[PDB]
Amino acid sequence: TECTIVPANHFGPIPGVPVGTMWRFRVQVSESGVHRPHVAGIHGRSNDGAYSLVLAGGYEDDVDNGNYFTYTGSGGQSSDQKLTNNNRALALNCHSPINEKGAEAEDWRQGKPVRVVRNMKGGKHSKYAPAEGNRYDGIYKVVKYWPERGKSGFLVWRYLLRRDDTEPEPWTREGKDRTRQLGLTMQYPE
């Protein structure tokens, strides 16, 4: 059943789903409303913004630093990516006018929020990935985005996101203490 407590185009935290929430399977992640697409790694609308993303490995030039991370858009390498569809959505989140050249946020915190989920498949490059399942790590914002052409010569769209959430990161001592207070357990299908 699709999440109905908030609309599909809801920006920001999902009511009742705290930072640190864990689900074994993507279908539960979707049903919770935190990341609606079952398979795709980003949810957005090209004229509104990006609502959520799942970090599951992605590309080799991406680096996960926990409180911040870099990220690569979709499409294309055999052809150029374009600042359309979800690449555009994510760029629109940045506190800056949309720019085919890339842009940096004026005040990054005034950007539209992005719900970030880390999935265990990211553990092959990131020490922040959960060992199992999927974990909601809170709200991040787009600090900047830019195009680049790597070894294939084709263009990819790149993003830097930084955490802006009042609850601590689940991997920290403070996060672990919140997980305890909230009684968070790996969630399974009922």
In the annotated binding site, the residues are: 56-57, 62
Which residues contact residue 42 at a Cβ distance below 8 angstroms, ignoring those fewer than 6 apart? 50, 52, 53, 54, 74, 86, 89, 90
Amino acid at 144: K
Rounded distance between C-alpha atoms, residue 92 and residue 123, angstroms: 29
Q: What SS3 class is residue 122?
A: helix
103: which DSSP letter?
E
169: which DSSP letter?
P
Cite the DSSP H helix spans in the chain.
Answer: 26-31, 85-92, 173-182
Rounded distance between C-alpha atoms, residue 181 and residue 69, angstroms: 28
Are the C-beta atoms of 171 and 128 separated by less than 8 Å? yes
Rounded distance between C-alpha atoms, residue 136 and residue 33, angstroms: 11
- Annotated binding-site ranges for DNA: 56-57, 62
